[PDB]
Design a protein around this nucleic acid. Structure first.
Length: 374
RNA sequence: UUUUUU
């Protein structure tokens, strides 16, 4: 019946785009932790550099609460901006965020103890607790410092041009660790080494300021655990995507790495589109499954409806990422994995093994791909 | 649920 087939297409599309949600919707308020973010009002290379090392040591300190790491990360990401407070208002948007700004004037010489501003709220108990935190590095860390080179932390910065080199190298490493914090973690990574080689070749990253892999893994762990930090990083990525050809040294880097962070955790969706709708010889095979084709059409509609934030569904860890899971289109997923194993050597390394992977349509895709080739 | 490469 033509009416039932037309009705079913409409029903399928409606059921999938009914999950778009509200762009400005605010969830019901739930308890949240208080986060203390440290702000430098003026551009002091000495103070800024010190705060960079302080926050790197807080992020890696074993005796540090989740709130302490979250504040240290927000401060570390905000070190480049000329106005720290106005850049921290971006972090405040997070619905799970309750950030308190603390203005720091300096550090006591020869110590990690903070010197709070008159307006800034810092007790003598907190200052001592933070100083003890900044000196609690893990055993896996060598030379008593996060960096690979011992002399780097001790180096004195008296110019803005120096702090910028140090800061941008550290933040390049932090962003590369973001690249696979929610998807790949607690395992050896080849891509991370490749990104570092690329950015050292570009001259963006300096090997004199590399961190130890243990510190990089600790930074990745701290970023993955907090939703405030990951939402703030999506805000920074969207700021980097709005730029034109003319841009700053920092947001050019952030856009370059956002190219690699984009569409993480949606590999099955984009590989299915690529190898099932990309090849002109797939319509003849999958023409029969109209229901799954309508599903993929409604998913391409849902992706556009989500907006720019759709590229960072995995970083944001939003529920709409369950719509793009291949268990809702298993036959076409199977066919596309078959086609892609022939056409892409790199795809073989990817784990396409699923409980629901149809072996018949996998082999249909393999034989179709090879047939066209030979 | 994710898991490749760019």
């Amino acid at each position: 019946m033509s009416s039932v087939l037309k009705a079913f297409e409409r029903f399928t599309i409606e059921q999938e785009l009914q999950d778009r949600g509200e762009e400005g919707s605010i969830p019901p308020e739930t308890l949240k932790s208080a986060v203390k973010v440290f702000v430098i009002n003026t551009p002091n290379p000495t103070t800024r550099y010190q705060m960079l090392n302080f926050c790197l040591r807080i992020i890696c300190s074993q005796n540090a609460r989740a709130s302490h790491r979250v504040g240290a990360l927000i401060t570390l990401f905000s070190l480049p901006s000329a106005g720290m407070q106005n850049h921290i208002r971006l972090a405040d948007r997070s619905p799970e965020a309750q950030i308190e700004r603390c203005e720091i004037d300096g550090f006591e010489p020869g110590t990690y103890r903070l010197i709070p501003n008159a307006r800034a709220n810092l007790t003598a108990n907190e200052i001592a607790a933070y100083a003890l935190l900044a000196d609690d590095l893990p055993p896996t860390i060598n030379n008593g410092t996060p960096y690979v080179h011992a002399d780097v932390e001790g180096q004195p910065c008296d110019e803005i041009e120096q702090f910028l080199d140090r800061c941008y190298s550290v933040l390049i490493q932090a962003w590369v660790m973001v690249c696979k914090c929610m998807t790949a973690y607690d395992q050896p990574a080849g891509s991370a080494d490749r990104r570092f080689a690329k950015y050292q070749q570009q001259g963006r990253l300096e090997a004199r300021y590399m961190l130890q892999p243990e510190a990089q893994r600790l930074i990745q762990t701290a970023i993955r655990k907090s939703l405030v930090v990951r939402q703030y990083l999506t805000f920074e990525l969207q700021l980097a995507r709005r730029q034109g050809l003319l841009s700053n040294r920092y947001y050019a880097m952030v856009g370059d790495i956002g190219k690699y962070i984009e569409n993480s955790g949606l590999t099955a969706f984009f590989l299915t589109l690529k190898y099932a709708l990309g090849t002109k010889w797939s319509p003849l095979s999958l023409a029969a499954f109209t229901g799954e084709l309508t599903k993929l059409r409604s998913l391409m509609m849902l992706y556009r409806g989500l907006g720019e934030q759709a590229r960072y569904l995995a970083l944001l860890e939003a529920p709409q990422i369950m719509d793009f899971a291949p268990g809702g289109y298993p036959l076409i997923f199977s066919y596309a994995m078959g086609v892609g194993t022939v056409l892409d050597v790199q795809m073989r390394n990817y784990t396409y093994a699923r409980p629901f992977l149809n072996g018949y349509y996998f082999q249909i895709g393999v034989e179709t791909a090879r047939r066209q080739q030979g």
